[PDB]
Structure formats: C-alpha cells, structure tokens
Ligand binder design. Structure first.
Ligand SMILES: [K+]
Ligand SMILES: [K+]
Length: 1517
DNA sequence: CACCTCGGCTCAGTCTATTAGCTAGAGC
DNA sequence: GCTCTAGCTAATAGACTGAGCCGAGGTG
C-alpha cells in the first residue's frame, strides 16, 4: 500500500523526478487532451528547436518549455532565471514549471505573473490528487501507469440526464437542483455529452463559475470523466487563487479567444466537444469575441446560479453575474442553471425585526431560469444513503465558568485573547470531543472527531486562535489535536499542502487536525473524511456560509454523521427570554439556520417538530469547565428557550400548503386521464375500471358514479404515500384491505400508461417523514394528522371536491359517553365494556375517536388491575367495530386505532391490524344486498358480513347532521334507504302531528332509528346529536315512541343554538361546542327486554351564558352520568308530548282563528306569505331590477329548456327550485308577464317589488284568493306561524306579504276572499266576500262582522295575552278568547290599524332634531355613532338624527325593534354569488323617502306604545 | 288513478367591522 | 441602518337568513 509520500521520500534519499512528471503529463487526463506528445529534452526530434528538463508539444502546434525542479530550498530567481531565459526564444509559445517547494519569494511570483508568454505552475498536491494511482506505479520505471477508475453515473444522475434531454426539446431554459456532494458537476457533463449526439459536428459549451479555483476543478473534473474527446478553454479577466495556478494555458482577451477557435477550425480532426470554462467576470470578454464573430454556443451552463440575481455580490462584480440571462451579452441556443440552493435565506437589514429568516434571493423567475427538470433533495439523498446526515450542535460555553478557571489566560496580555476568543477555543475542544455537557457517567457522547475546518470573520482572529491554541487548551486540561492557519496571501501550492495535511490518512490515531481561515478553503478539494465544520463568528456573505456547510456532506467509511459546531459564549446574567436575539454573538446561529433552510428541504418540518420533540440533527450543549452551579442550575430552562426562539422567529413555513397546490394539479391530470380512457367503452382496461366502480357500488352505494370513483381513487393516491411516510416503521407491506384493493386497480391502469407522478412530491414525503421521525406516541401522531388536515388535505383535495368536512369530536364529550356507557352496562345489564361478547360499534367513526378512547378507558382499568391485557386484546380483535363512508376518515380511523392499541400493549407484541373497521354505507348495509361476485373489496365486505351477524349491545358515535341541502342550486340528491326510511316512517313520522315532516329523514334521526333497530332487544346507545328532537314540533311523535321503546333516556343538553334566536335567547344558549349554529345534546338510550312500561326521562341543562370551554370543563369535572346525577332532574312529559317549556293553560278552549282542516275557525281561510325560493331574483327595492333579473332567468330557462345537464353549473343567471325543475323538465316554455309585478312587504316596514308569477314562485299558498291581481286590495293581519320562544307580535298589512315577513313562515288572516264572478271578462273576473265565518261570530257574542279584524288585532297587542299564553304561542297558531268589554279593544285596534297602514306617512315627533350639513339623501348604511346609543342615528355623512326618545325602541315586531328594522333593511347590499345589488334608493322617486320613512316609524313606535297602555285589564268573559 | 297544487318548520357558520401587531418605505 | 410614519395583515369582535322537500290536499 505505497503512497505518493513514499515515492517522494525515495527521491529524497534528478531524473527520477523527471519521470514522475513525465508519467503525470502523459496520463493525467486533462494533459493527455492538451499535449499531442511529451518527452525528455534528449529525445526531442530534430525537426524543431535548438539543443528546461522536459518539453511538450500541444495540438496547436506550439511547444512548451517544462521545468522539472527537485529542490529542498526556497525558490529564488537563481532557480528560475535560467529557464525564463531559455523560454525567451521565438519557437517557445509558453512554459510550465513543476515546482516541488511551496514557498516562493516576492520576486519569483512577480516575474512569473508579468512574463508575456505566460507561465503556469504545478505542485506536489496536484500530483498527489491526480487521477494516477501512485500505489501501483513503481520506480523500476516500466513507464506504464494505472489511471484511477473514472466516475460511473448512478440511477439518480441517469434520471437527471433523461429529464434534461426530454425537457430541452421543448424549452431553451431549465434548472438543475442537486444537494452538495451528490455530483452535479459530473452530472452536467453527462447532460452535455448526451445532448452532443443530436448535434453533428462539435458541441460548444460555456461553463460559467464564480471562482478560479472552481474553474480548475471543473476543467480537470470534466477532462477526467469525459467519455468523448474534448477541447478546453480557460478564460479569465476575497481570498481566491490566481490565474497562473490553473495549470492550463489561460486566455487573456477576446483576441486570444478568436485565435483559439481559428486554430480549432483549422484542426485536421475536430473534437466532439469544445467547452470553454469561464468565470462570470469574463462574460464581457466572451461577448466581445462573439461580437467579433465567435460562434454562438449550443449549451450555456450556469454553475452556482443562485448568485446570478446579483444581490449577493459587490456592486462592481454584481453586474457581471446577471448578464448571462440574455443572448444580448452571450448568445446561446440553450442554457442550464445548476445550483444546490435555488432559494437563499438570511437576515433582514433591521436588527429588531421579529422574523430572523427571510428569503433574500430566488430563482422563481422561470422566464430567465426556466423550470426545474430535476431535483435531488438533501433529505432525499440521505434517505437513499447517498449523503451522510448532519448534526448541528450549538454548544453554549458558560462565561461564568470560564472566567473562574481560565483567569490565567485572561490575565496574560501578551495574548490578544479575550473571553470570546477563549470561549471559542474551549468550544472547539469540547465540540471536537463530542461533550455531553450539563446533563450518564461518561462526559463524552462518543469517539472524538479527527478532522475539521474552522471559519472566522477576520485573518487576525484565525491567526489568534490557531497560534495560541495548544497553550490555551493545556490550561483547560485522551486525544491531542493541533491547529493550523490559511489565508489568501498564500499561493495555490501552500493551500494544496494544508489541505493534504488535514486529509492525510497516514495521520496517526490520538491526533486530530483543524485548519482555520475566513474565505480561503470554502472552495477546494473535496475530502470526504472531513468530520466537522466550525463557525467561530458571523460572516459578511451568507453565500459563503452555504458553501462551507456543504463541505461535510460526502460519505466516508468511518463517518456516521457530519457535524457543524457553533461555539457560543453566554454573557453571564443572560435571560432566557432574550437569549438568542439581542446580541451580535448570536448572529452566527441564525446564519447557519438560514443556510440549512436553503440546503435542507425538511428543515421547516424539523422546526415544526421542535414543539413536541427534539430531533437528532439539533443539539444544544451546556459547556462549563473540563471534566474531573450558575447556568448549570437553570440549564433546562435555557436549553428549551433556545429551541423556543428558533420556532418563534424562523418565519413563514408553508411547505404543506405550497405542495398541496402541486398535489391538486396532479389529481386533475389523473382524473382527466381516466375520463379519456373511459370514452373508449370497449377498451379493455375500461372494463376493469367498470368492475371497480361496481365493487365500490356493492360496498357503499348505488349513487357512486364513475366520477366519484375517480375521485376516491385520486384521494387514495394522495393519502397513501403520506401515511407511509407518517408511519415509516410498521409491517412494511400494507395490510389494510381497502388500501390493497386500491393498489390493484392502480396497477391495472399502469399497464395502460397511467403513472402516479410521484417523483416530484418526494420533497413533500421527506418533510412529512421528518415530522414523525423521533415521535413515539399515538397522541402525538394524531396531532400531526390534524395539522395535515388543516394545512394540506383541504387544499390538496380541491381538485376532486372543493369542500372537505371531517368532524373532530371534542375529547371531553367522547370520554363522557364512554365512561357512562360502562356505568350503564354494570347497573342495568350487569356487564362492562371489557366483558365478553359485549360488542361495541361506531357506525360513523370518522377519525376513530370513540373507539380510541374506548381502548384508553380499558387501559386505565388495566392499570387499576381490574382486567387483563388479554381482555383488551379480545375487544380489539373480536368485539370492536367501526364503519366509515369517507376514505380519508377510514384511513385516519384505521391507523389511529391500530396506533393507539400498539401503545397499550407495550412491548408485549408488535403492530396488529384492526379488523373491526369497514368501508361502508351503514344505512345501506341492512338493505337487501344485490349482485356482485368478483369484488376488488371482497375482503372488505367480508368484514361487514361478519359484523352483520354479530349481536350489537353498544352503539357510540357522532352521527352526521343533515336535514336537507342548503340550496337547490347545489343539485344534491338526498340518499334513499327503503328498509330504514320505512321503519322511520312507521314509528316517528306516522305518529307526528306536524304538517311539515321534512326533518324526520334527517341523517341524525336516521342514525337513531338505525341504532334502535340494530340493538334489537337489549343494549345501549350513546350519541351527540342535533338538539331539535327535544323541543321540535314534528318530533312529538318521535318523542312519544322513544318512551315506548327505551326504559331510560338520559339527556344532557349542551345547547349552543344560534339560528332563529333573539339576543336574549342566544345568551342563554351560550357558546357552541362544534362552533356551529345548531344546538347539540348528549343523549343516552337504554332499552331492556324485561321493562314493559313507559320509560323515564333524565334531563340536565349544562347552564347559561357559558362559552364552549366552560361547557367542556363541566363535562370533564363530572366525568360521567353518575358524577352529574346530583344536578340531573327527572322529566314528566305532558299530554302534548313536551319535555321542556311545557304548555299548561286553557288554550284549546279558545276560538280558532284559522284551521285548514275543519270549519271551526273564525276565518274561512288564511294564507302563508309569498315564498319565491329565489328572493335575490324575485324581491328587490328596484322594480326595474326585478324585471331585469327575471327576464334574464326566463331567457336562460327558455334557451336550454329540457336540458338537465345545466343543473350542474350553478350560474348567477337563474336560481332553481324543485318546482321550476319539474316545469323545466316538462318542457313548459316561459314568457315575461308585466302584469304580475306586485308591491309587497318583505320585512316589517319594508316594502319591495315582487315578480309574483306562478311559474316562478315556489309557494303562493292561498294568495290567489287573497290578492288575485297586482291591483287587488285587501287587509290581512300578518304574524308568525310559531313564535318559537319570541315575544308575540303582529303587523297588519295592506300589500303582498313575504313568507319570511315573520319567522317560522308568516301567516296572514285576510279581511276578504276572492271568488270568480262567473263572467268571461279577464279584466274583471273576481268578486270579493267577507272571510269571517258566522257560526263562530255567535261563539263570540257582542261582536259584529265589521269589527272582527279590529277586535283580533287589538287583542294581539295586549301584554297579558302574550304573557299568559307565551308557551302556547311558542308552539302553536294563536287562538282568541272572549273578553267582557270588547269596545275597548275594537276602538284601540282601529287606531293601531290605521296607524300601521300609514306607517310611511306620519308627522315627525316633538323633540327630534334633524341635522343636514349638505343636501344628499342617499344611504349606504345607517348606524348608531357608538354601539348601544339609541338617542342618535347617523343617516349618512351629511345627515344625522338626534334626540330620539329611547322608549320608541320598546315597540318590537318579529324579533327586532321597529326602528332597527329600518336600519337593518335599508342599506345598500350586494350578493356576491348572484351579483345582484339591492339599493333602497332605487325604491322611490323621492330621495327623502327613506329619511321620512324612519322619522315616521319613530312616531309610529311611540303612538303604538301609548295605545298599548290604554288597553284594558285582560278579563275572561 | 295520473298529475298537479298546496302546508309547512326547521336548518353540522358565514359574513363585516375593528384593531392589535408587524412591516415596507421614505427621508435622513 | 436608523427612526419615524402611514398602511397592510392578521386575529378578534360583532352581527345574524331564506328555502328545502315529505306528504296531504286538490281535480278531471
Ligand atoms: K488575555
Ligand atoms: K407495541
């Protein structure tokens, strides 16, 4: 195993050096391509020259005078003066010195730099690091040498080549991203070589690169690895190497460049490639060459392209860097930009900014940079074992500790050292020793690092540390490590020497070696054995930091990890809140952090992980004195604060939501691909895909379309790889039945050319994988999936469906139910959740919370020693079940349950798949099965069949609430289940007394009915459901049936209902648990076969004025039903079937005002308000706007009439209703009817225009009998069908009332009714008659027909009537009594009726003050100046009202004051989706209309209140 | 039947206005 | 590179409707 050192030490103990040089010059690849032949100057042919140790003839025809000196002394001019004289001849073009001594005087360097012909120097290190194998070369001198094996390209490099070729056929620009040490300089060669094949003739390349050292390596590198013949040109025009050290004929000017091509053109046999290695500075010179007729380039490579934006360089040089992007400077057909860090991060100019990590540069301008055609991430490289993973160790040395023990070094002033310089030295030592610091017995983590490079800001510092290093460490008190220094004042030979000294493998053990500098060894020879890179102080250029960090990536046999060490002194007295941001010393930490953000793609994920766990790549070490308390004490606080500061200040980590955009676009491609192949109904793979939909249809629903199949398939392709990364260490092959069936259909499509496009999302998978790496808890893994749901999945699924909804049920609610189900089983059934053959089921598992917290409950019991792990194992393996219809929820649920069980069984056994989960429609499961044999999901529906035959005694869950689609334009078909809906009918619908039984087929009500059926004779049901069934009108039948089935019904009402509630009502409801508007309740059902009487009801109200957090704390405190049984109260249902707010009084004895079935009521008939089903189109302040909206709808309707497909669009042109769709499908053409425009009251005291035409109205009800034509006159008392808890109110109306004029649908009691006058005259075809029934008037004696309205209307305003029958009015249509003295009511009623009909026109009140600054009566939005002040109103900028009486606001109609109705309704608003605006200023000709309206209402309010006082004492008979 | 018209009553949050906190820009 | 400022970006607070769709009732 001889080395180059052995050869040289042999020459030490003439011609033998002339031989090494000759062996080198004829075989070193780059000089094999430069020189045609080489020889000693004795065998030089006689045909040229005059009687220097060597001579060389290059293919140009020019000769070169080579000197082969073997000295042991300082090179003086005496050693050189002879050779330069011999080089003086005309026949010599140049010379080349092969020096064997790295020390050169000032004279020798100047003369060589100035010599016109040009001289290049080579040294020992150049021979050492040559491609020659000196171990197999011998001084027997056979003159046969072994050239080292050239580089072989790898799979990822081969891929980059494939992508480069493919991409550069369509575009002229593309960028190449590859992590450091992976091989992007060698890779670009094979890209150029591959491109060369298409071009017949020579292939001309331009390789740009910032440094000269970096030019030498690229030139030599390409010549070493080229498989083609190559002609090279080194063009040249802050520690860096000089152009004399290139070892290659340097090209000075544009004149020389052109001279080189004319020689290349006049060459007998032109080479395959003519590459010109140039610096970014010399672009000017190459431009002048192209200007003077130098040909354009076939390929322009831009190395270190992240600097080509120009912002990182000095203003002088910065211009040169950016000049590459345009052909104006350098013409080229195509150009490739290669870098390791396309995005550069760093510090902002502001010191006190919150964000310490901001993007400085970026190659996001894809116009000049093109797009990325290949990206080999650092994390990806570590994954495939291409690079070693790094470890950042911040070791904070204690100033207090050092100042004590290092006082000797601090004292001696002959040293230029302070606490910082000494803190740096102990930091280096402790860093290289891998010290553990402030915690095992051992002080170090492992064997010491042997090779490193330290980086300082100044040469003075670098010299300061290294020079006195040996002495300082001795005072500090194994291994003996030495230091060195290097700077730009050295030449290339010395530099090559120090790097060989560092990298020397003959280095003994117990000796480590460090080298210090500033910017000198940032670029240089790769040494894989380099163990660490130390940063001792901040740097000017961040680009240097990024370069330095990449020096440890390469793989070495001994290197497990690369290390980058940050010696930092903490100033004694430092606080943890200010530890890392408020001082210059800490700057170096943020530079490194920003450097990794640029290099490592999973670095953002690494910081998001710091929240719950400390990753392996980061380490904060507390260093005090050497081995055998001030910061030791609070170290745990300081260590944690450092990580906290990182997480806090590194800004804007958006990797998940950025990649989600890329993911959505792939899904769009995949789905389109399917659509195309499905067009070929005959195509063979399309048949296989039909069986896949058929399989989904068998397991789930008939409704599953061919599209929804492609949607599910795409969603699977997104989730599967993420879960693989999220749970890396499980049984390698996926054991999930549904997942396996999904891979079978995909592989089926892969035969047809379909691919997953997974190559690009590898950076994403790497990020996810890092979030989960060190995490070892199920509860933590669940938290990651939640963030993935929030940041990634919603956006990623946008291509398939724009709305994604998964309910994460609050854990306090789930625990309460699981706790109490166990309580119920013991007391009522004498069993437990843990008991044998007690099968639990969650039909709507979602995320799997209920099954999970069931397992954690059994765990807590196992801890107490109540049951075994054999019991829990039994439940998990046999008696736990779960159903989900959504695929994402299914995957989350399966993994969540499998993950949490694996934690419960400790190390008792490994990962076990959960067989209880099934992908189904549970409502469809109990329906009659139909045909499928060949089932992709045959293993999945097999699980269902096992579940079907199991007797279920427990059902938990949070079923989906859905009574109806929100709007018809959505075009959602509600699902049908014959067997279930039939049961639901026969029990809860047939028994209901309501006119409308819509909501009884709500999913949550379906879930209850399904659960009831499933239990059969004995069991328990525990849900969290919609509130409505407790006090809903259509549920009275249901409420009665539950008592018959179940022995016990525990109801814990969590309230939280906002919709249709007053401010007074909403306050008691409090905050909502799910942050929704519907109320919610926990309900526990228990049925027993030996319980034959009506069950009892246990009701508990959580409380009033509670936010959601307070409601959950109460559930947590209680833990169970038993814990809250004290606050529980029993409920006795009345005859009507009410549980809460029970009706009492004589209400049914009173006289009916209206009755659709029967002639008992006072009014012969009444009508509900007009219901359009499209208010934005039908209702508007502007009569013109309505016409425009409706004529648009008619023209749209008629244009596509009959065509059902446009239902899928949802345009602003038209709003659909079931009624209209039926007409649409029935081919009924429509036409505008101007006569059908009405004036009507939309909201109280708010008149609008309506297009009341039958075809465009959902429900006109009995309006044809009340207001036949637009000009019809009538009088109708309007009021809500049911107040629903509101204070009773009414408003007499002269115009067409809207259905929602009052809540719960308005109901209008008319004065007259209209019948056909039985004469054929369409202009006059309606006779009117009184609507009062006479028989009832007898039952109301002393009341004439003419006064009925004024009597009813006068009575409605009595405070007593509303108060006494408040609960009756809340759940029923008003009924009227017979009072002693009616004349009091009739008289009062008439005054109010006249007042309220003339509400628009009324005198202004006494003490009001109207202020008009300028005459502008338009209104945008009326307001109170500040919230709560009623005595003033701001009409607009110019007009304000002042001194309004506050009592006026006591007049309330519906659920809002009369004054506030005007404020609410009269404002300019625009519906976004429809794009229709409702301007109240367009209602009237009078600009002062709305102002005078308000002023009128103010007095109308007051008058009404006065008249309400004069109403008599409410007496019966 | 065959097909239309009528009677409800209930509905798994979404908007606008405010405002603390932070930054990007202008002149030094 | 700073010190101040008017302007955005967030969370944070505050305000708060229209119409679907099962089933009964009509009519020739
Ligand atoms: K000192
Ligand atoms: K385990």
């Amino acid at each position: 195993k001889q080395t180059f050192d052995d050869l040289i030490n042999q020459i030490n103990t003439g011609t033998l050096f002339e031989k090494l040089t000759l062996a080198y010059l004829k075989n070193e690849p780059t000089y094999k391509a430069l020189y045609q032949n080489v020889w000693l100057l004795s065998e030089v042919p006689e045909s040229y020259g005059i009687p220097v140790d060597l001579v060389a003839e290059q293919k140009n025809g020019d000769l070169v005078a080579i000197q082969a000196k073997f000295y042991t002394n300082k090179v003086g001019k005496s050693e050189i003066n002879s050779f330069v004289a011999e080089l003086g001849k005309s026949y010599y073009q140049r010379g080349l010195i092969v020096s064997t001594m790295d020390d050169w005087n000032s004279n020798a360097r100047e003369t060589i730099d100035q010599n016109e012909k040009g001289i290049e120097i080579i040294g020992l290190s150049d021979l050492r690091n040559s491609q020659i194998d000196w171990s197999q070369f011998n001084f027997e001198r056979p003159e046969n040498v072994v050239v080292k094996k050239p580089k072989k390209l790898r799979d990822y490099q081969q891929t980059a080549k494939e992508n480069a070729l493919a991409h550069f056929k369509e575009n002229d620009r593309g960028q190449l991203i590859m992590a450091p040490g992976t091989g992007k300089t060698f890779t670009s060669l094979k890209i150029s070589e591959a491109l060369s094949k298409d071009k017949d003739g020579p292939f001309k390349v331009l390789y740009l690169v910032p440094s000269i050292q970096l030019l030498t390596q690229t030139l030599r590198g390409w010549n070493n690895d080229t498989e083609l013949t190559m002609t090279s040109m080194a063009v040249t025009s802050t520690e860096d190497i000089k152009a004399s050290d290139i070892g290659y004929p340097a090209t000075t000017s544009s004149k020389k460049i052109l001279q080189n091509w004319h020689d290349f053109e006049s060459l007998p046999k032109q080479t395959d490639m003519l590459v010109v290695f140039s610096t970014y500075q010399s672009i000017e010179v190459i431009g002048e060459a192209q200007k003077e007729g130098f040909p354009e380039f076939d390929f322009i490579i831009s190395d270190e392209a992240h600097r080509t934006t120009g912002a990182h360089e000095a203003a002088k040089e910065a211009s040169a860097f950016s000049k590459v992007h345009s052909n104006n400077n350098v013409k080229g057909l195509k150009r490739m930009y290669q870098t390791a860090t396309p995005k550069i991060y760093g510090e902002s100019a502001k010191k006190n900014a919150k964000d310490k990590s901001i993007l400085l540069s970026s190659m996001d301008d894809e116009s000049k940079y093109g797009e990325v055609f290949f990206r080999m991430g650092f994390g990806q490289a570590v994954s495939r074992d291409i690079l070693t993973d790094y470890k950042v160790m911040v070791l904070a040395v204690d100033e207090a500790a050092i100042q004590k023990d290092m006082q000797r070094t601090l004292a001696d002033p002959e040293n230029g050292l302070n606490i910082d310089d000494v803190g740096r030295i102990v930091g280096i030592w402790n860093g290289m020793m891998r010290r553990n610091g402030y915690k095992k017995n051992s002080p170090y983590d492992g064997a010491p690092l042997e090779r490193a490079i330290a980086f300082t800001r100044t040469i003075e510092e670098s010299k300061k540390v290294s020079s006195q290093f040996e002495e300082v460490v001795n005072e500090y008190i194994s291994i003996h490590l030495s230091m060195r220094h290097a700077d730009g004042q050295m030449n290339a030979l010395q530099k090559g020497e120090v790097l060989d000294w560092l990298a020397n493998p003959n280095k003994p053990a117990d000796e480590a070696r460090i080298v210090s500098n500033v910017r000198f060894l940032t670029e240089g020879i790769d040494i894989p054995t380099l163990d660490a890179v130390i940063f001792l102080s901040p740097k000017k250029s961040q680009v240097d930091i990024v370069q330095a960090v990449g020096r440890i990536m390469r793989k070495a046999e001994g290197k497990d990890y690369g290390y980058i060490i940050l010696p930092i002194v903490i100033p004694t007295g430092e606080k943890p809140e200010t530890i890392l941001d408020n001082n210059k010393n800490y700057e170096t930490v943020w530079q490194v952090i920003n450097a990794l953000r640029s290099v490592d793609e999973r670095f953002e994920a690494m910081i998001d992980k710091l929240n719950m766990a400390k990753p392996k790549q980061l380490k904060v070490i507390g260093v005090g004195s050497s081995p055998d308390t001030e910061l030791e004490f609070e170290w745990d606080k300081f260590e944690g604060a450092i990580f906290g500061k990182i997480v806090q200040k590194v800004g804007d980590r958006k990797y998940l939501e950025n990649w989600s955009k890329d993911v959505a676009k792939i899904a769009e491609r995949q789905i389109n691909w399917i659509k195309n192949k499905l067009s070929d109904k005959k195509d063979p793979i399309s048949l296989e895909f039909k069986k896949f939909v058929s399989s989904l249809q068998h397991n789930i629903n008939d409704s599953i379309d061919e599209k929804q199949a492609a949607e599910m398939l795409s969603q699977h392709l997104i989730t599967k790889p993420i879960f693989e990364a999220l749970f890396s260490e499980y049984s390698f092959v996926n054991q999930n039945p549904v997942s396996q069936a999904m891979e079978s259909i995909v592989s089926e499509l892969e035969k047809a050319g379909f691919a997953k496009e997974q190559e690009n999302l590898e950076p994403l998978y790497e990020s996810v994988r890092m979030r989960a790496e060190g995490i070892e808890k199920a509860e933590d893994k669940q938290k990651i999936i939640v963030t993935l749901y929030d940041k990634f999945f919603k956006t990623a699924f946008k291509a398939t469906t724009e709305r994604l909804g998964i309910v994460f049920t609050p854990i306090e609610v789930v625990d309460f139910i699981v706790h109490s189900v166990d309580d119920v089983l013991k007391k009522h059934f004498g069993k437990s959740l843990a008991s044998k053959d007690v099968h639990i089921l969650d039909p709507f598992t979602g995320t799997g919370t209920f099954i999970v917290r069931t397992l954690t409950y059994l765990k807590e019991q196992m801890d107490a020693g109540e049951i075994s792990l054999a019991d829990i194992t039994r439940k998990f393996m046999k008696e736990l079940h779960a159903n989900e219809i959504v695929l994402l929820s299914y995957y989350i649920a399966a993994i969540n349950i499998e993950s949490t069980f694996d934690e419960i069984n400790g190390d008792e056994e490994g990962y076990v798949p959960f067989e209880g989960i099934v992908l189904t429609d549970t409502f469809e499961s109990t329906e009659t099965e139909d045909t499928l044999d060949d089932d992709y999901f045959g293993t999945n529906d097999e699980r269902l069949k096992r579940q079907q035959k199991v007797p279920i005694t427990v059902i938990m869950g949070n079923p989906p609430y859905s009574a109806k689609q929100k709007n018809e334009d959505g075009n959602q078909i509600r699902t049908t289940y014959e067997k279930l809906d039939a049961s639901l009918q026969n029990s809860w619908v047939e028994t209901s007394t309501a006119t409308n039984k819509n909501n009884l087929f709500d999913s949550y009500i379906r879930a209850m009915r399904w659960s009831s059926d499933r239990i059969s004779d004995n069991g328990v049901i525990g849900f969290i459901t919609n509130n409505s069934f407790i006090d809903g009108n259509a549920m009275d039948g249901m409420r009665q049936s539950l008592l018959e089935e179940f022995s016990d019904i525990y109801v814990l009402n969590l309230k939280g209902g906002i919709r249709g509630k007053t401010k007074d009502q909403s306050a008691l409801e409090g905050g909502n648990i799910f942050d929704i508007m519907t109320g919610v309740t926990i309900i526990m059902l228990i049925k027993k076969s030996d319980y034959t009487v009506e069950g009892r009801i246990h009701y508990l109200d959580i409380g009033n004025n509670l936010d959601k957090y307070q409601k959950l704390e109460k559930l947590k405190n209680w833990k169970s039903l038993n814990g809250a049984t004290s606050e529980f109260q029993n409920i006795i249902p009345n005859e009507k079937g009410d549980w809460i707010n029970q009706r009492n009084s004589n209400f049914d004895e009173l006289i009916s005002l209206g009755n659709k079935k029967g002639s008992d009521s006072l009014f012969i008939d009444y009508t509900g308000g007009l219901k359009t089903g499209r208010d934005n189109w039908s209702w508007n302040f502007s009569k013109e706007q309505v016409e425009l909206s409706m004529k648009s709808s008619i023209d749209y309707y008629n244009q596509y009439l009959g065509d059902t497909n446009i239902y899928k669009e949802d345009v602003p042109d038209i709003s659909w209703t079931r009624s209209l769709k039926q007409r649409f499908e029935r081919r009924e053409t429509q036409s505008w009817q101007g006569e059908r425009m009405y004036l009507g009251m939309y909201r109280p005291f708010t008149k609008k225009h309506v297009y009341y035409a039958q075809a465009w109205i959902d429900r006109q009800y009995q309006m044809t009998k009340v207001l036949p034509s637009s000009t019809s006159s009538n009088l109708m008392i309007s009021l809500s069908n049911k107040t629903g808890g509101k204070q009773f109110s009414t408003l007499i109306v002269d115009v067409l009332p809207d259905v929602n004029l009052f809540t719960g649908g308005s109901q209008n009691l008319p004065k007259y009714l209209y019948r056909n006058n039985d004469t054929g005259n369409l202009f006059d075809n309606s006779e009117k008659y009184s609507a009062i029934r006479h028989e009832v008037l007898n039952k109301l004696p002393n009341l004439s027909e003419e006064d009925a309205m004024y009597y009813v209307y006068g009575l409605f305003h009595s405070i007593q009537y509303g108060k006494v029958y408040y609960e009756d009015l809340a759940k029923s249509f008003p009924k009227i009594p017979n009072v002693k003295h009616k004349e009091k009511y009739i008289k009062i009623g008439k005054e109010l009726a006249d007042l309220h009909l003339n509400y628009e026109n009324q005198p202004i009140c006494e003490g009001i003050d109207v202020q008009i600054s300028e005459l502008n009566y338009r209104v945008k939005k009326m307001k109170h100046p500040k919230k709560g002040v009623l005595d003033t109103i701001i009409y607009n900028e110019s007009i304000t009202i002042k001194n309004i009486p506050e009592k006026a606001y006591e007049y309330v109609v519906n659920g809002r004051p009369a004054i506030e109705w005007i404020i609410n309704q009269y404002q300019v608003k625009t519906d976004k989706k429809s794009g229709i605006t409702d301007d109240p200023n367009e209602f009237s000709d009078d600009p002062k209309y709305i102002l005078n309206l308000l002023l009128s209402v103010i007095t109308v309010s007051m008058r009404t209140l006065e008249l309400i006082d004069e109403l008599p004492e409410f007496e019966i008979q």
